[PDB]
Amino acid sequence: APEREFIKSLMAIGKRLATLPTKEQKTQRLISELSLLNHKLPARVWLPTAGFDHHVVRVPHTQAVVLNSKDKAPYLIYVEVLECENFDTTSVPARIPENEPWQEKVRRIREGSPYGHLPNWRLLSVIVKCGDDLRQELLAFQVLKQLQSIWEQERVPLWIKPYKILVISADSGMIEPVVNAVSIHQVKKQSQLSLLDYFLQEHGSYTTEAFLSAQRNFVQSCAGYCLVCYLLQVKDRHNGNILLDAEGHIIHIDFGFILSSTSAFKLTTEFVDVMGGLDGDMFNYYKMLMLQGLIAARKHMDKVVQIVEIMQQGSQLPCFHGSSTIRNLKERFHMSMTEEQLQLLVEQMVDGSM
Ligand SMILES: COc1ccc(NC(=O)N2CCN(c3nc(N)nc4c3cnn4C)[C@@H](C)C2)c(C)c1
């Protein structure tokens, strides 16, 4: 499989970075390795996350990043590709010698690239995870796609961003990154502000449309991911694993600890202050969206449970501790309860989150 030799050498770099002790040391090896890998490009190799036929021409080593984590060495790359009509039939491009928002990232790399002038030039971006098992993430991705359209169909304006997972092996794979987004940890570290103060500074003040729309996005995304976290039993929830985007949505990531596999969905005081406090209109709206999404989820529960059963049946997954996993999942929809008892459930759920 020469067409995968790009993939195998990428996963090798990842395993090597897991040997190095510090981010600084991982960065310098990543650069060194990618620089070496450009000597083997351009080639008849793909990056499987893309939706179109292409050949990988170049990997700019200066723009690759080692990401934070406890154990492993996850790293982000920006892969340059020339698009083609067909993968197998179109000739591999000749090698042309050498000498933040997405549009700027694209512009700056394109201007610096020897391939950037060409009409078929495209830039793709992927996070490479080696060591970790992304079947957990991939199940979550599918449940997210399903829930998104359950809320689309019943007119409920909850908001979640499913991101594409690609399982290469049992202990490796690829995640497509969220582009306009940084961790809540990083926002707080860089700004030295509360989340409310960050909103007020970055978007605008309490009565501006910029704020109110960003606050609306924040509320809708929290309520969305709160239900996701309850239904899927998502653990490992911290400001490292929650992103904030340029529009003011939150994005939960890293659904590796779900179902039968402390650390639950915490609604912090600083989160509640972004919604104008407990005795407030947008917090009442947050509680409404949780109730509205849950009734929409109850009616369409077969469409989710289908997706769960299809991904466990051909695995020996750690989250699947036998048929208790679907049994407990089903019970979390609470079909026997009334809508009045579901209000009390939502209220008890929010109290538990605080
Ligand atoms: C406690 O000290 C920590 C500090 C920060 C982080 N976290 C982190 O830096 N990021 C930024 C890069 N990351 C992603 N960025 C973007 N843009 N899209 C993504 C991901 C992950 N999935 N997706 C879709 C994730 C690694 C989250 C941590 C764990 C601990």
Cβ atoms within 10 Å of 330's Cβ, excluding its own: 14
Ligand 1, atom 5, lies closest to the CA of: 240
Which burial class, exposed, middle or buried, applies to 74 when counting CB atoms under 10 A from its CB (0-12, 13-18, 19+)? buried
* Integer angstrom CA distances of residue 110 from 75, 93, 225: 21, 17, 36
Task: Kindly list the domain boundaries of the chain, sorted by start residue.
Answer: 2-130, 135-163+178-353
Instruction: Name residue, tokens 């077969």.
Output: 302
Listed in order, strand segments (DSSP E) in 206-277 are: 242-245, 250-252
Helices 281-299, 209-232: inter-axial angle, 10-degree rounding: 40
Ligand 1: centre distance to CA 255 (Å): 12
User: With the C-alpha atoms ordered 109, 115, 117, 122, is the resulting torsion angle positive or negative?
Assistant: negative
Helices 23-37, 5-17: inter-axial angle, 10-degree rounding: 160
Cβ atoms within 10 Å of 51's Cβ, excluding its own: 7
Which of 129, 243, 257, when mutated, tests ligand 1's pocket best, judged by the most ligand atoms within 8 Å of its CB? 243
Cβ atoms within 10 Å of 339's Cβ, excluding its own: 10
What are 85's two structure tokens? 């009509």
Listed in order, strand segments (DSSP E) in 27-152 are: 54-58, 65-66, 75-83, 121-130
Tell me the C-alpha distance between 97 and 300, whole Å: 56
Among 140, 219, 132, 114, residue whose Cα is nearest residue 174: 132
Cβ pair 274, 195 in contact under 8 A:
yes
Which burial class, exposed, middle or buried, applies to 84 when counting CB atoms under 10 A from its CB (0-12, 13-18, 19+)? middle
Cβ pair 57, 105 in contact under 8 A:
no
DSSP character at residue 65: E
Q: What is the DSSP string of 275-325?
A: TT-SSSHHHHHHHHHHHHHHHHHHHTHHHHHHHHHHHHTT---SS--TTHH
Q: What is the DSSP string of 125-184?
A: EEEEEESS-THHHHHHHHHHHHHHHHHHHTT---------EEEEETTEEEEPPPTTEEEH
What are 167's two structure tokens? 């399982």
User: With the C-alpha atoms ordered 27, 32, 37, 42, is the resulting torsion angle positive or negative?
Assistant: positive
Distance of CA 238 to the CA centre of its chain: 14
Cβ atoms within 10 Å of 43's Cβ, excluding its own: 17
Amino acid identity of residue 90, one-letter, is T
Can you tell me whether residue 242 is helix, strand or coil? strand
Cβ atoms within 10 Å of 310's Cβ, excluding its own: 11
Give the experimental resolution in Å.
2.8
Cβ atoms within 10 Å of 110's Cβ, excluding its own: 16
**H or E element in which residue 88 lies:** none
Give the helix, strand, coil percentages of the chain, each rounded to 5.
Answer: 45, 15, 40
Task: Tell me how the structure was determined.
Answer: X-ray
Which CATH class, in words, describes the domain spanning 135-163+178-353? mainly alpha
Among 119, 110, 145, residue whose Cα is nearest residue 255: 145
Ligand 1, atom 21, lies closest to the CA of: 253
Ligand 1: centre distance to CA 78 (Å): 16
For ligand 1, residues with CB inside 6 Å are: 67-69, 74, 127, 163, 175, 177-178, 181, 183, 185-186, 240-241, 243, 253
Cβ pair 109, 60 in contact under 8 A:
yes
Tell me the C-alpha distance between 332 and 325, whole Å: 11
- φ, ψ of residue 80 to 5 degrees: the values are -85, 135
DSSP character at residue 92: P
Which of 26, 68, 76, 263, when mutated, tests ligand 1's pocket best, judged by the most ligand atoms within 8 Å of its CB? 68
Tell me the C-alpha distance between 291 and 306, whole Å: 23
* Integer angstrom CA distances of residue 109 from 33, 48, 51, 80, 174: 19, 21, 21, 9, 22
152: which residues sit within 8 A by CB, 6+ positions away?
Answer: none
Query: Please, what is the end-to-end C-alpha distance for the chain in angstroms?
Result: 51
What are 191's two structure tokens? 């700004």
